[PDB]
Amino acid sequence: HTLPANEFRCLTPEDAAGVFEIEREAFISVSGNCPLNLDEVQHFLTLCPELSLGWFVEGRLVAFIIGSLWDEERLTQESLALHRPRGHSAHLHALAVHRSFRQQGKGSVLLWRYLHHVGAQPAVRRAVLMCEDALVPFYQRFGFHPAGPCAIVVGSLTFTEMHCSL
Ligand SMILES: CC(C)(COP(=O)(O)OP(=O)(O)OC[C@H]1O[C@@H](n2cnc3c(N)ncnc32)[C@H](O)[C@@H]1OP(=O)(O)O)[C@@H](O)C(=O)NCCC(=O)NCCSCC(=O)NCCc1c[nH]c2ccc(Br)cc12
Ligand SMILES: [Mg+2]
């Protein structure tokens, strides 16, 4: 009978459109490319929805994290489009907050909830992601440790790999 003020839940393929719209402004508008295109988000939201998390305000998505499992120490080009069911690493492919809602704890809150949520599942022993040099200190506030240049290639941008033990 009503839209909740704030709702945190795992995503489903139907949320595919919403997340892509957020990415268009968060990533594409800034680099001409984005972590996951509509098909790649549907993919992960189909095989591993439990590895995703979204914040909805009044029925609209305002923040999300899309992940999958990985089974290797470091991230590689192929990990970009894979889900290793037997992996013990939660690979965060994308983390973004809607333009009109940034700078007010949302990202930090979603990330901590995500960490505990995924860390609830005993199989998952670690969380990994790629990030721009300027966000390294941000992720360190969460227990992540810089782990050198990430091997993954994307246009001309450079990334530092971050590893967090759960
Ligand atoms: C970074 C987030 C998620 C944080 O959300 P917020 O709700 O604003 O965070 P808050 O909890 O309010 O706190 C924000 C803190 O982070 C800092 N911060 C936020 N944005 C930035 C920025 N652009 N530069 C430096 N610091 C920043 C900020 O200063 C603040 O600290 P403060 O308290 O001292 O002011 C938000 O700004 C956002 O959605 N930005 C746009 C998307 C983004 O940058 N996502 C994260 C990237 S790392 C994780 C990730 O998804 N990596 C994939 C890599 C990748 C793959 N393919 C690609 C193609 C293109 C591009 Br480009 C990138 C890729
Ligand atoms: Mg060039």
Swiss-Prot record:
Binding-site positions, acetyl-CoA: 95-97, 103-108, 139-141
Family: Belongs to the acetyltransferase family. AANAT subfamily.
Annotated phenotype, changing residue 139 to F: Reduces catalytic activity 30-fold
Top-level taxon in the UniProt lineage: Eukaryota
Tissues where this protein is expressed: Highest expression in the pineal gland, followed by retina. Expressed at much lower levels in brainstem and pituitary gland. AANAT activity also detected at low levels in the olfactory lobe.
Summary of subunit composition and partner proteins: Monomer. Interacts with several 14-3-3 proteins, including YWHAB, YWHAE, YWHAG and YWHAZ, preferentially when phosphorylated at Thr-2. The interaction with YWHAZ considerably increases affinity for arylalkylamines and acetyl-CoA and protects the enzyme from dephosphorylation and proteasomal degradation. It may also prevent thiol-dependent inactivation. The physiological stoichiometry of the interaction is not clear. In vitro studies show either 1:2 (i.e. 1 AANAT molecule per YWHAZ dimer) or 2:2.
Residues of the full protein shown: 30 to 195 of 207
Catalytic activity, as annotated: a 2-arylethylamine + acetyl-CoA = an N-acetyl-2-arylethylamine + CoA + H(+)
Organism field: Ovis aries
Main location class: cytoplasm
Pathway info: Aromatic compound metabolism; melatonin biosynthesis; melatonin from serotonin: step 1/2
EC number, as in UniProt: 2.3.1.87
Function of the molecule: Controls the night/day rhythm of melatonin production in the pineal gland. Catalyzes the N-acetylation of serotonin into N-acetylserotonin, the penultimate step in the synthesis of melatonin.
Consequence of substituting residue 131 to S: Reduces catalytic activity
Consequence of substituting residue 93 to Q: Decreases affinity for acetyl-coenzyme A and for substrate
Compartments it resides in: Cytoplasm
Keywords for the protein's UniProt record, in alphabetical order: Acyltransferase, Biological rhythms, Cytoplasm, Melatonin biosynthesis, Phosphoprotein, Transferase
Keyword Iron-sulfur: no
Region (YWHAZ-binding): 1-6
Known outcome of mutating residue 91 to A: Reduces catalytic activity 270-fold and decreases affinity for acetyl-coenzyme A
Residues spanning the membrane: none
Annotated site location: Important for the catalytic mechanism: 91, 93
Protein name (Swiss-Prot/TrEMBL): Serotonin N-acetyltransferase
Modified residues annotated as Phosphothreonine in this record: 2
Induction: Exhibits night/day variations with a 7-fold increased activity at night. At the mRNA level, the nocturnal increase is lower than 2-fold.
GO process terms (BP): cellular response to cAMP; circadian rhythm; melatonin biosynthetic process; N-terminal protein amino acid acetylation; response to light stimulus
Gene that produces this protein: AANAT
Phenotype for residue 30 to A: No effect on enzymatic activity
One GO MF term: aralkylamine N-acetyltransferase activity
